[PDB]
Design a protein around this ligand. Structure first.
Ligand SMILES: CCCCCCCCCCCC(=O)O[C@@H](COC(=O)CCCCCCCCCC)COP(=O)(O)OC[C@H](O)CO[C@@]1(C(=O)O)C[C@H](O)[C@@H](O)[C@H]([C@@H](O)CO)O1
Lengths: 233, 256, 237, 49
């Protein structure tokens, strides 16, 4: 109707949201350095099920507990006090911490060759590199321990069973212990974690231009709609 | 009177008029509208139930086809019925209140209401037969459906405005609509599609909307790489802007 | 207040001609030639192997290979040589991520899965530098596909040494000999079908092609802004 | 673990509590409702919530 004048429409549709967005993106947003590593799991002398474990162990909660107890991620992500959106507020719930960690660490699996890439965000490039290295090391240790547990459970039966019977018992014990001690599988590192120089997040001008286009289009649509409505007299 | 109240008056008038002409008077068209989705299910499920069970054993075929079909039927109707809106009401285009925008809005409202009713009926039937019929994420599904509404109505208005003359061109609309049933992920999951056909397949906004709706419907549904809401949302916004501008240019030329 | 100014001629000269004259005078004069050296390789196991080729396809664009190459060959100094073509030169003092983006755009890797081959095309402002860069890429790639299995061989040899330390004895000695054989053997060899060539005429500054796309994009921009201006003029009646 | 004893504790909620003395089949249905098992096709991991 007559209340929605053009000046009010453009002030409330393209001017004010862009002003708020540019203020936030230039004076409040915090840089987020990203470190990327590319890995695969190989069996030392099919393998899709081996690397499919890592796609859900990286986002698992136990790995998050290990990481925090190691590198203290909880107070690192709360350091930037200027940005209220991408910081981790103190005293938040454990589930929110897990969701935030899952948002920070991004895992892509390319299935044409089973290549797994991990991109880790942080507020200091050295911290991001250290977090990526810790994730790789813990994943390798876990994929080792997965077979280690089965081999030692086999060995427990062999030691519980214990002169042909004695000979086969000691042979089985030797096989079980060489299974429980060996290095069953190793994680091949196609691209080791890198130390970034600048932060690629957030790319401020991209969202500024995109959102400017969005508000321009939205204001145009609303103005044309109200013009067509006011056509009837 | 204010423009807003006369707007409700004229849209209610054309809405009941359009219900009259589309339903056939004796309310016979509801049987047709109810019978197309179930006939599609009966044809569709008899050749690819085993193939789908080999592909995605965790998802039932009929609910997958409901979520793939009914939004697509709604989009197809929103395009087709709104494209031919001007010619149907041509004889009554001089009352100083019957501008073409009211006609296309009335047709859009009618189609949205009818297909929403069909959606509710199909979901109730699916629940009645012991299938899974509650979306785990409801309002994201509603938002994706709203994006689909905006895109479909915008495309319909754009085609109605552009092709007021040369109605022969309307053919290369509906003839082009038939491949969109196959190429988009409606009847068979795009998981089985080879990746070497994948890039061009990503150019379809309807495929993105259908996949996102299915992901928001079922629990633990995987999305392909490159599927996003930003591309179809921008497509819908740009098409709506273009259609509104083109209607504003040729507003006075749609009267005879 | 404005629609009386932007008529057809003003808008046409603003968005269809002046940017186009700028683009032509940049491409035909200011642009610098870029020579292209092309090689075709694949990996076959000595004595399928698609996975090795995909590891290589990832490794060509990897950051570590870029660090090794720039150190060996001083890529940063070479790519900053032509001051005539900035829109395609590597400005000094740029970040490492932009350096990675520039290197990724300057090297093209093509998979061919029907027949199983990798094509590497390298662009450089001099042909000899492009050929040397291609050769360095090939030799570092062969060294990488060697070390990838050498690491696992040494990793098994560590357990072999642990087993000899535990102790039967001749079995442990044979296992350690096999482990050091594996750690020393040339397991995988990169065979080359087309070795890198020395180009003569630059190829990638296909100026007519970019001008052809610029034609249609400027026409689209002109049409859209003309429609917007007509909408505003209709609103001002 | 006395599941039936535990699930009857919240008296404020009238729909998500387990009433006393209900049918055994209804108990089985309620237990199936509480325990959610999802099987993933690509890798075969089974998640229990
Ligand atoms: C944006 C352009 C894209 C072009 C796509 C072309 C593909 C084939 C289309 C089928 C072409 C077609 O028409 O459908 C066929 C059967 O389709 C199929 O089974 C498709 C099988 C596989 C396709 C799906 C796999 C997709 C795989 C990846 C893409 C019978 O349909 P139908 O009974 O409705 O035929 C009615 C006529 O179309 C009427 O049209 C006329 C005419 O012929 O009299 C009318 C009039 O004369 C004029 O308006 C008009 C003319 O003059 C104006 O150009 O032609």
């Amino acid at each position: 109707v007559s209340r929605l004048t053009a000046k009010r429409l453009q002030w409330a549709l393209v001017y004010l949201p862009m002003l708020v967005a540019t203020v936030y993106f230039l004076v409040f947003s915090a840089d987020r350095y990203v470190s990327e590593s590319v890995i695969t799991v190989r069996q030392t002398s099919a393998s899709r099920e081996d690397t499919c474990y890592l796609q859900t162990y990286i986002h698992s909660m136990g790995l998050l507990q290990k990481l925090d107890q190691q590198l203290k991620l909880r107070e690192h992500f709360g350091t930037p006090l200027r940005d209220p959106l991408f910081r981790l507020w103190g005293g938040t719930s454990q589930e929110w911490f897990l969701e935030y960690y899952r948002s920070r660490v991004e895992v892509l699996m390319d299935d044409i060759c089973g290549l797994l890439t991990v991109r880790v965000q942080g507020f200091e490039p050295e911290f991001a590199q250290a977090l990526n290295r810790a994730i790789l090391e813990e994943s390798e240790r876990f994929v080792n321990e997965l077979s280690h547990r089965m081999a030692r459970e086999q060995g427990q039966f062999a030691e519980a069973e214990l002169e042909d019977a004695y000979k086969l018992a000691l042979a089985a014990v030797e096989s079980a212990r060489i299974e429980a001690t060996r290095k069953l599988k190793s994680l091949v590192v196609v691209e080791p974690p890198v130390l970034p120089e600048i932060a690629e997040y957030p790319r401020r001008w991209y969202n500024l231009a995109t959102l400017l286009v969005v508000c321009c289009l939205i204001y145009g649509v609303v103005s044309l709609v109200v013009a067509t409505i006011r056509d009837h007299q | 009177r204010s423009p807003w109240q006369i707007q409700q008056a004229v849209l209610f008038a054309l809405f009941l008029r359009e219900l009259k002409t589309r339903l056939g008077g004796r309310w016979l068209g509801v049987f047709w509208v109810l019978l197309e989705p179930v006939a599609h299910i009966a044809v569709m499920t008899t050749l690819f139930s085993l193939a789908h069970r080999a592909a995605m054993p965790s998802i039932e075929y009929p609910v997958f086809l409901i979520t793939g079909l009914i939004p697509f039927f709604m989009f197809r109707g929103l395009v087709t019925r709104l494209m031919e809106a001007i010619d149907s009401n041509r004889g009554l285009f001089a009352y100083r209140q019957v501008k073409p925008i009211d006609t296309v809005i009335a047709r859009a409202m009618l189609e949205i209401s009818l297909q929403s009713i069909v959606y509710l009926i199909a979901l109730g039937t699916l629940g009645w037969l012991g299938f899974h019929f509650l979306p785990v994420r409801a309002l994201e599904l509603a938002g994706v459906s709203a994006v689909l509404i905006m895109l479909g109505a915008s495309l319909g208005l754009f085609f109605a405005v552009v092709t007021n003359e040369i109605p022969q061109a309307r053919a290369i609309v509906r003839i082009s609509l038939l491949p969109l049933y196959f190429v988009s992920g409606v009847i068979f999951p795009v998981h089985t599609i080879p990746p070497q056909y994948l890039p061009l397949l990503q150019l379809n906004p309807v495929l993105h909307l259908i996949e996102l709706s299915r992901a928001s419907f079922f629990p633990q549904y995987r999305v392909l790489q490159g599927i996003n809401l930003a591309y179809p949302a921008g497509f819908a916004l740009l098409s709506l802007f273009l259609a509104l501008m083109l209607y504003r240019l040729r507003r006075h030329q749609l009267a005879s």
